[PDB]
Design a protein around this ligand. Structure first.
Ligand SMILES: CCCCCCCCCCCCCCCCCC(=O)OC[C@H](COP(=O)([O-])OCC(O)COP(=O)([O-])OC[C@@H](COC(=O)CCCCCCCCCCCCCCCCC)OC(=O)CCCCCCCCCCCCCCCCC)OC(=O)CCCCCCCCCCCCCCCCC
Ligand SMILES: CCCCCCCCCCCCCCCCCC(=O)OC[C@H](COP(=O)([O-])OCC(O)COP(=O)([O-])OC[C@@H](COC(=O)CCCCCCCCCCCCCCCCC)OC(=O)CCCCCCCCCCCCCCCCC)OC(=O)CCCCCCCCCCCCCCCCC
Ligand SMILES: CCCCCCCCCCCCCCCCCC(=O)OC[C@H](COP(=O)([O-])OCC[N+](C)(C)C)OC(=O)CCCCCCCCCCCCCCCCC
Ligand SMILES: CCCCCCCCCCCCCCCCCC(=O)OC[C@H](COP(=O)(O)OCCN)OC(=O)CCCCCCCCCCCCCCCCC
Ligand SMILES: CCCCCCCCCCCCCCCCCC(=O)OC[C@H](COP(=O)(O)OCCN)OC(=O)CCCCCCCCCCCCCCCCC
Ligand SMILES: CCCCCCCCCCCCCCCCCC(=O)OC[C@H](COP(=O)(O)OCCN)OC(=O)CCCCCCCCCCCCCCCCC
Ligand SMILES: CCCCCCCCCCCCCCCCCC(=O)OC[C@H](COP(=O)(O)OCCN)OC(=O)CCCCCCCCCCCCCCCCC
Ligand SMILES: CCCCCCCCCCCCCCCCCC(=O)OC[C@H](COP(=O)(O)OCCN)OC(=O)CCCCCCCCCCCCCCCCC
Ligand code: HEC
Ligand code: HEM
Ligand code: HEM
Lengths: 388, 244, 70, 32, 64, 59, 39, 51
């Protein structure tokens, strides 16, 4: 084939890269809907960006005007309550979808070779989402907003030699005042574009090494083009997600939040129950469970170290959980542990929740510490079960 | 102890504006605004609601104009730099009873009567909590004698609240002759407060119903589309030259 | 990223000669049976710790409150 | 071929105008 | 202007007299004590929780 | 069949198909809005703003 | 039958897209307090 | 604290000065073109009008 005269626009250089990577990318023929969850997370990110821009057309980053500006958006702006509820509940759905993404990856062991770079870029993406959502939640400037900012920024003092200096520098002036508000608005506006860049790199690395499948096996025998076969599957996922998200926006918009964020920030009194948003609760529970706050920060760093250390395991030959009963049970126990851990974080430090959290976090790390053992034993399996 | 600290739990009352197709009782909103103006505006403030917010919701435009013309507000400098007071217009927010938080606390014994604009969204189980708080001024239990200068209220965290029992039988004279009792006054004021915290509830509910229905139909279409496009693949027969 | 051929023979029918929304309803009892009999263990390992911990927590809270009730 | 081409262009123009009216319903312009 | 809530709670007082009896038992114990912290707000909370649960729908179906 | 008839009507040129899709979107949205409005008004009788007894007696 | 099912879904999608676009643009449009201060 | 303000508001300043507002002098050398020379000449050049 010499391309003398042009046949198809899709194969022209203007649409050639897009053609390959969107229409013609070969995909395993047996993918279920969790790959749809990955695409759905992308859509949630785009929704957040658009609604955030149109919200920032009305938000004043000053300490004396932020709360009343948000109430302006809700009451005066034409269809502004829709924008604000979409932004908040869209942050929530973004985190829900990313959690389902991560747990599918864990179940099917997609972190294994050769997708170590994909998993690591995913971990970086998760860090960026955490930071962006936190600094954004500081913006409305309520009781929960101000006090959560105070606590989570002041736990950065646990660094041995330069903790206090970093805390003061990040605060900008001995407290979490107007300077911190402007700082957080600028950072919240900036970070989503770095998040878009990270997502693009994530997808590029995956596209380099293909895509896993529910069997975990080599899958270059039966492969089909992405369009239209997986576009329609993703479309079904998107419409179902739209119905879910519309249930949340219109009928129960304040269920996923706390009522203390509707009181203007008053640094004098302290609300009796200071907790982050529901999607930071597992991390908050781990950190609160391990005492000696320096130990808590070290434990969070250890959580991310374990997450980054999953891909680089030794044998781990069989990949999918469909052929790993022990690992299947371990994964389900880990998921139950994560849900319980998230529930613990909303409870006070009074007993027995301290014991329950100190057990749950230990079980979390135990999952992360017993996967190589299963891999080694499984590597030992084939020379024992032979039927002859 | 902990029980009194977290307060007696509030029941689940059947509010008229509860349900996927349920609107505010606008007569009750009007009645609640009356009771708030009569008894609650002496200490509490709203400061987030304009008089124009009442137009088409509980009052007619001329009525709101007259009500605004009743009160007087300070307007900016004139051609001499001095300040002056003019009757309120249809855009001014509800008047504030106290100069600032310090004056409010000084007038109310150090306790600050909270702003009531978002009161039902600033408490857990907002509307039920507010109704129960207003109605449940009960005799304190045995051997729990609270200090002078407060009142016992089981729902309030700690049991001791700073405002006195305000809603009394016959406190106000309703315009439409509705018999004023404590429960009725509480219901009306909580309906008004819940409207104030969320004036978009009806439009939001209508949009939600319409779009959930429409998107459900879209979901059926998308499922059919996916099945149709995948049916040349799922109903296929392949011969592979292998057995075991 | 090469493609490995397998030397098969595939017959396929056009999408407009097939029933499109009937396979979802053909074998509901058998499919429900298969789901339950294949995932009851995983359901126990998921919902087991949660329900057990919940029961333990409510039990202990009841004991503690009744004990501190003067 | 030209009659068919201009007919198709006019049909697409009618579709575009219908989409424009749908996006921006203007009885103010429709009435006169 | 008889209070509907007070009348309804008085009417439903004999519905769940068991928490009320427990509360009275604590009242007698506290009267015997007369020296301790002697609160037992738990019985109060249980009894009034029952009454409030009773008077949930009747109040609004009686209100205008 | 009715499907074949309407196909021969509005499924031979794509321009007519897109115009039909837009017109159907407008008409269907209006119909659903009218139905939901009737349902809402039926369900919330008496509670409307237009029918409160003292709407114009403060003057 | 397939094309008519697809057409029903398609004008559902058209309705959704118009709704979203108009919501964004009218949000960027004027405001109630400004209209009140128009005198 | 900052430097005090001689007048409560711009309208007060205008009323005091017969409708003229004495501009803020913080950036007067950058607000006016050729600010330094302009201000020096204006302060010192109070001459007699021509015929
Ligand atoms: C817990 C309770 C479990 C009950 C299980 C019952 C059962 O037998 O389920 C399996 C059974 C089929 O088993 P399967 O073949 O293994 O599953 C279908 C495949 O996944 C292949 O699916 P499909 O493409 O053939 O069908 C498309 C569509 C069919 O469904 C529909 O058309 C509407 C479904 C409405 C559900 C409410 O959806 C499904 O079948 C289910 C997946 C829906 C998409 C979910 C994507 C993620 C959304 C994330 C949102 C954000 C969080 O499915 C059903 O019973 C569902 C249909 C029931 C009758 C209604 C039909 C309406 C037309
Ligand atoms: C994955 C998807 C997770 C969805 C979680 C949704 C959520 O946060 O709901 C809590 C959220 C909190 O509202 P709330 O508990 O009424 O008010 C908070 C009060 O403090 C009253 O709170 P409370 O004391 O009554 O109970 C608080 C409890 C809420 O109570 C319940 O949910 C009760 C059961 C319903 O909060 C939680 O359970 C929050 C943690 C749950 C999510 C943890 C997700 C962990 C994912 C894995 C993390 C892995 C980390 C490392 C990754 C690498 O909503 C609800 O509890 C009601 C709606 C539930 C809808 C569930 C189905 C749709 C999703
Ligand atoms: C309007 C709502 C229609 C809801 C129809 C539900 C299914 C009715 C039974 C049926 O014919 O199912 C098979 C049909 C598909 O036909 P089929 O080809 O799967 O089945 C042919 C075999 N018989 C006729 C025996 C069933 O299912 C659907 O059409 C699913 C709904 C798609 C249409 C959605 C329109 C949205 C408009 C906005
Ligand atoms: C709007 C966002 C569009 C994003 C499109 C995808 C990202 C840009 C990719 C640009 C690129 O690297 O294009 C390569 C191509 C070089 O030409 P070619 O020899 O055909 O290369 C094929 C690859 N081996 O480059 C070209 O031929 C030029 C492509 C220009 C960019 C067109 C993007 C779409 C515009 C509509
Ligand atoms: C609630 C939270 C859910 C989180 C889900 C994360 C992803 C888990 C997953 O991928 O589960 C799929 C798995 C299906 O097993 P698999 O071997 O993939 O498929 C065989 C097909 N017959 O599923 C299973 O094996 C069992 C699924 C149900 C387990 C829980 C049931 C109660 C809830
Ligand atoms: C109090 C302090 C101590 C607490 C812990 C003490 C107990 C430790 C564990 C004891 C039990 C270990 C059992 C290991 C052998 C499992 C045997 C096995 O694989 O059986 C096959 C079965 C297959 O299932 P299926 O296919 O449904 O069967 C139908 C067959 N035709 O397979 C299955 O049914 C799958 C079962 C998977 C179970 C996985 C979890 C238990 C084993 C590892 C425990 C690790 C604990 C720490 C980590 C927890 C997770 C973070
Ligand atoms: C990105 C979007 C697509 C960009 C396409 C143009 C790219 C740059 C020019 C490429 C070269 C060119 O001329 O392409 C046009 C293409 C040529 O046809 P081809 O397949 O190359 O070979 C036949 C030879 N005549 O001709 C075609 O493919 C035919 C396309 C004709 C489209 C005309 C109808 C448009 C109607 C108005 C918009 C839709 C109306 C409804 C919505 C209204 C608004 C709400
Ligand atoms: C692209 C810019 C579109 C601008 C536009 O159409 O603005 C709307 C403007 C006023 O129209 P509208 O307020 O909807 O009608 C009053 C009562 N029918 O519309 C007009 O004043 C007339 C619009 C005519 C169609 C313009 C299409 C471009
Ligand atoms: C002056 C006296 C009044 C009047 C006429 C009313 N309130 Fe009340 N209120 C007042 C104070 C000083 C306080 C603070 C008490 C404290 O928080 O320690 C309050 C408190 C409230 C609350 C908050 C309760 C809580 O946060 O748990 C509410 C919801 C409230 N007040 C409502 C309310 C209503 C509806 C009134 C009209 C009937 C009303 N107050 C009158 C002081 C005063
Ligand atoms: C901004 C949020 C994210 C987006 C937009 C995103 C996007 C995607 C996309 C588009 C794919 C390819 C399609 C698919 O397989 O589902 C993918 C795959 C993948 N992602 Fe993500 N992702 C995100 C977050 C994460 C996170 C936090 C992780 C884990 C740390 C992760 C791990 C993976 C893995 C392992 C795959 C491989 C899929 C497979 O094995 O089949 N992603 N992601
Ligand atoms: C560049 C894109 C974005 C912009 C411009 C933006 C801007 C804003 C603004 C102005 C607010 C305050 C308005 C309000 O109070 O509702 C806000 C709130 C918030 N944003 Fe964003 N945002 C963006 C993207 C994101 C992303 C990607 C997330 C992560 C999910 C996020 C999470 C949040 C959260 C949690 C809040 C607080 C919700 C609340 O108001 O209660 N934002 N954002």
């Amino acid at each position: 084939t010499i391309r003398n005269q042009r046949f198809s626009l899709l194969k022209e250089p203007i649409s050639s890269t897009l053609n390959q990577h969107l229409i013609d990318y070969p995909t395993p023929s047996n993918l279920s809907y969790w790959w749809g969850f990955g695409s759905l997370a992308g859509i949630c990110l785009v929704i957040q960006i658009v609604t955030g821009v149109f919200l920032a057309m009305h938000y004043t980053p000053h300490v004396d005007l932020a709360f009343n500006s948000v109430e302006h958006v809700m009451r005066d702006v034409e269809g502004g309550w829709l924008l604000r509820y979409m932004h908040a509940n869209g942050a929530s759905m973004f985190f829900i979808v990313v959690y389902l993404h991560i747990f599918r990856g864990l179940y099917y062991a997609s972190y294994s070779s050769p997708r170590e770079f994909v998993w690591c870029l995913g971990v970086v993406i998760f860090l960026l989402m955490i930071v962006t959502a936190f600094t954004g939640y500081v913006l409305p400037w309520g009781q929960m907003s101000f006090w959560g900012a105070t606590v989570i920024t002041s736990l950065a003092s646990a660094i041995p030699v330069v903790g206090d200096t970093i805390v003061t520098w990040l605060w900008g002036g001995f407290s979490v005042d107007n300077a911190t508000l402007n700082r957080f608005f600028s950072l919240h506006y900036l970070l989503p574009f770095l998040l878009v860049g990270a997502s693009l790199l994530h997808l590029a690395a995956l596209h380099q090494y293909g895509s896993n499948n529910p069997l975990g096996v080599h899958s270059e025998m039966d492969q089909i083009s992405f369009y239209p076969y997986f576009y329609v599957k993703d479309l079904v996922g998107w419409v179902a997600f739209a119905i879910f998200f519309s249930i949340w926006i219109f009928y129960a918009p304040n269920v996923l939040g706390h009522p203390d964020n509707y009181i203007p920030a008053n640094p004098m009194s302290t609300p009796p129950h200071i907790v982050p948003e529901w999607y930071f609760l597992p991390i908050y529970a781990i950190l609160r469970s391990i005492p000696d706050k320096s130990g808590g920060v070290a434990a969070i760093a250890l959580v991310f170290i374990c997450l980054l250390a999953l891909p680089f395991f030794k044998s781990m030959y069989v990949r999918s959980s469909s052929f790993r009963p022990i690992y299947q049970g371990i994964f389900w126990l880990l998921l139950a542990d994560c849900l319980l851990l998230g529930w613990i974080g909303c409870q006070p430090v009074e007993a027995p929740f301290v014991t329950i959290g100190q057990i749950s976090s230990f079980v979390f790390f135990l999952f992360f510490a017993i996967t190589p053992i299963l891999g080694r034993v499984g590597r030992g399996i084939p020379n024992s079960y032979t039927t002859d | 102890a902990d029980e009194a600290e977290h307060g007696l739990a509030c029941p689940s009352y059947p509010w008229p504006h509860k349900g996927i197709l349920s609107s505010y009782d606008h007569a009750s909103i009007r009645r609640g605004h009356q009771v708030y103006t009569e008894v609650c505006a002496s200490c509490h403030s709203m400061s987030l609601i304009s008089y124009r917010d009442l137009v088409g919701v509980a009052y007619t435009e001329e009525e709101v104009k007259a009500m605004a013309a009743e009160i007087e507000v300070v307007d900016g400098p004139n051609d001499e730099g001095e300040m002056f007071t003019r009757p309120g217009k249809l855009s001014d927010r509800f008047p504030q009873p106290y100069a600032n938080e310090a004056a409010a606390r000084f007038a109310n014994g150090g306790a600050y009567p909270p702003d009531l604009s978002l009161i039902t969204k600033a408490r857990h189980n907002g509307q039920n909590y507010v109704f129960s708080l207003l109605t449940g001024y009960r005799d304190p239990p045995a051997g729990v004698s609270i200090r002078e200068g407060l009142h016992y209220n089981p729902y309030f965290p700690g049991g001791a609240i700073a405002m006195p029992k305000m809603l009394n039988d016959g406190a106000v004279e309703y315009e439409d002759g509705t018999p004023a009792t404590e429960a009725q006054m509480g219901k009306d004021v909580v309906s008004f407060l819940s409207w104030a915290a969320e004036p978009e509830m009806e439009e939001r509910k209508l949009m939600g119903f319409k779009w959930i229905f429409v998107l459900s139909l879209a979901l059926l279409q998308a499922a059919y589309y996916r099945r149709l496009r995948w049916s040349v693949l799922k109903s296929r027969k392949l011969v592979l030259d292998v057995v075991n | 990223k090469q493609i490995v051929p397998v030397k098969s023979v595939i017959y396929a029918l056009s999408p407009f000669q097939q029933k499109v929304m009937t396979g979802l309803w053909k074998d509901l009892p058998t499919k429900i049976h298969h789901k339950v009999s294949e995932n009851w263990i995983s359901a126990t390992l998921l919902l087991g710790p949660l329900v057990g911990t919940y029961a333990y927590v409510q039990n202990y809270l009841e004991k503690e409150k009744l004990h501190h009730r003067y | 071929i030209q009659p068919a081409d201009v007919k198709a262009a006019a049909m697409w123009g009618v579709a575009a105008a219908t989409g424009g009216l749908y996006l921006v319903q203007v009885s103010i312009l429709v009435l006169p | 202007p008889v209070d509907q809530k007070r009348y309804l709670e008085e009417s439903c007082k004999p519905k769940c007299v068991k928490p009320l009896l427990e509360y009275q038992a604590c009242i007698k114990r506290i009267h015997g004590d007369d020296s301790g912290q002697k609160h037992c707000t738990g019985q109060y909370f249980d009894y009034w929780f029952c009454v409030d649960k009773c008077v949930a729908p009747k109040l609004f179906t009686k209100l205008k | 069949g009715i499907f074949e008839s309407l196909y021969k009507v509005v499924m031979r040129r794509n321009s007519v198909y897109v115009t039909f899709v837009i017109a159907g979107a407008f008409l269907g949205e209006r119909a659903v809005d009218y139905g939901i409005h009737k349902l809402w008004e039926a369900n919330n009788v008496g509670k409307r703003y237009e029918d409160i007894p003292v709407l114009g007696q403060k003057l | 039958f397939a094309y008519f099912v697809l057409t029903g879904g398609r004008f559902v999608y058209a309705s959704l897209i118009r709704l979203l676009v108009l919501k964004f643009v009218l949000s960027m449009s004027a405001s109630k307090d400004v209209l009140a201060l128009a005198s």
